[PDB]
Design a protein around this ligand. Structure first.
Ligand SMILES: NC(=O)C1=CN([C@@H]2O[C@H](COP(=O)(O)OP(=O)(O)OC[C@H]3O[C@@H](n4cnc5c(N)ncnc54)[C@H](OP(=O)(O)O)[C@@H]3O)[C@@H](O)[C@H]2O)C=CC1
Ligand SMILES: NC(=O)C1=CN([C@@H]2O[C@H](COP(=O)(O)OP(=O)(O)OC[C@H]3O[C@@H](n4cnc5c(N)ncnc54)[C@H](OP(=O)(O)O)[C@@H]3O)[C@@H](O)[C@H]2O)C=CC1
Ligand SMILES: COc1cc([C@@H](C#Cc2c(C)nc(N)nc2N)OC)cc(OC)c1OC
Ligand SMILES: COc1cc([C@@H](C#Cc2c(C)nc(N)nc2N)OC)cc(OC)c1OC
Lengths: 165, 165
């Protein structure tokens, strides 16, 4: 029924960890730079918790915050309360990026068409996870090694998967 | 329609600069060494401007110059005036290397199967750029750090991408 491409944007470790104590467990500026380039000009869909850890709208993109709170407001951001409201808000969009965290990934999981996933080759201590996915009907359409250096201290790969349908 | 592998050979910086004042903006002998090793025994396809900055044929390879000039001639070099003429000239070749500059990269962009790209981690002053590429259905199949030393004063990586089709 929806016509925008629903894409996931996530970074995770070898045990699917995405978060620790409501924060990112790793510092990877180069990964962030890849994320900004890929998502620029497209809506970001993020969970209330995810957003408040940032505290500020990300420029050049519609920032849409998903919460059950019907009186929740933040300047420079739009607020949705469900999958369907997000779909209404993004009716005419080309592609939207589901941007985390876990609760919001779970929420949008039945509708994902494309998966932009960074895989970090390290086992972090974590408390928040990227949900399991059945990859049957999914094709890897892009893979490349991320930049490892003194500013980016882990090995990691950018992966993109597309659903076949 | 064509049977030869069409490969790009290019070095660019972090903003896609490949040229300044009809020349290379950097001196990297080690990068040249990798280029000669990789392209040896295979045709080089070069734009007229690119070639004249060199002024002489590169040994051990067919040098093919692309120009609109129907009376253009250079000793020890072959001359093509279109994509199709290059294809005709290279119909039996296993792999040809599109060797620059930008106008010629643009020209052969719809037909590229393999991308040999050096990425230089520096922002040069430039006037000539490597075209944007949609890398969907491309996979990185090789990546290695280039030699940084007193003779090669920048950080750079060799990348190879292959089209999946
Ligand atoms: N590595 C990565 O790619 C990323 C990692 N992260 C990490 O993830 C963690 C945050 O994830 P998580 O704790 O899951 O929190 P979320 O970001 O998923 O936010 C959860 C909130 O979303 C709202 N929500 C959840 N379900 C619904 C629903 N069905 N309808 C309406 N609103 C809903 C609720 O808001 P409310 O309570 O206000 O009602 C809930 O509290 C952090 O550690 C963060 O650093 C986040 C993004 C990316
Ligand atoms: N960093 C790198 O990997 C490389 C960088 N370079 C740099 O790039 C710059 C040169 O690039 P650029 O200025 O784009 O010049 P090009 O090498 O792309 O040559 C342009 C010329 O090619 C011919 N040409 C262009 N389009 C066509 C066409 N459709 N049909 C037939 N002939 C055509 C024309 O020749 P004519 O006028 O005779 O008709 C045109 O003037 C230089 O600075 C060089 O150093 C070059 C190679 C590699
Ligand atoms: C850049 O802006 C940020 C974004 C996020 C977000 C995310 C993400 C995110 C990342 C990092 N990588 C990928 N591949 N996908 C994602 N969805 O939550 C962790 C947190 C940040 O710091 C608290 C950010 O810095 C202000
Ligand atoms: C070696 O022979 C040369 C070739 C080029 C060519 C190129 C290239 C080129 C380079 C350097 N690196 C990569 N990764 N791809 C390319 N396509 O145009 C700039 C210029 C030269 O000096 C004027 C060369 O020395 C005689």
């Amino acid at each position: 029924h929806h016509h925008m491409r629903v894409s996931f944007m996530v970074a995770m470790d070898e045990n699917r960890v995405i978060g620790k104590d409501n924060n990112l467990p790793w510092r990877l500026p180069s990964e962030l730079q890849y994320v900004k380039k890929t998502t620029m000009g497209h809506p970001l869909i993020m969970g209330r918790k995810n957003y408040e850890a940032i505290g500020r709208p990300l420029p050049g993109r519609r920032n849409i915050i998903v919460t059950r709170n019907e009186g929740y407001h933040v300047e420079g951001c739009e607020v949705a309360h469900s999958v369907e409201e997000v779909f209404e808000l993004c009716k005419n969009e080309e592609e939207i990026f589901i941007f985390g965290g876990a609760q919001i990934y779970d929420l949008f999981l039945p509708y994902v068409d494309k998966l932009y996933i960074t895989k970090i080759h390290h086992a972090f201590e974590g408390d928040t996870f990227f949900p399991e996915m059945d990859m049957t009907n999914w094709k890897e359409v892009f893979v490349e090694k991320g930049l490892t250096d003194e500013k980016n201290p882990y090995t990691y790969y950018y992966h993109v998967y597309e659903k076949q349908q």
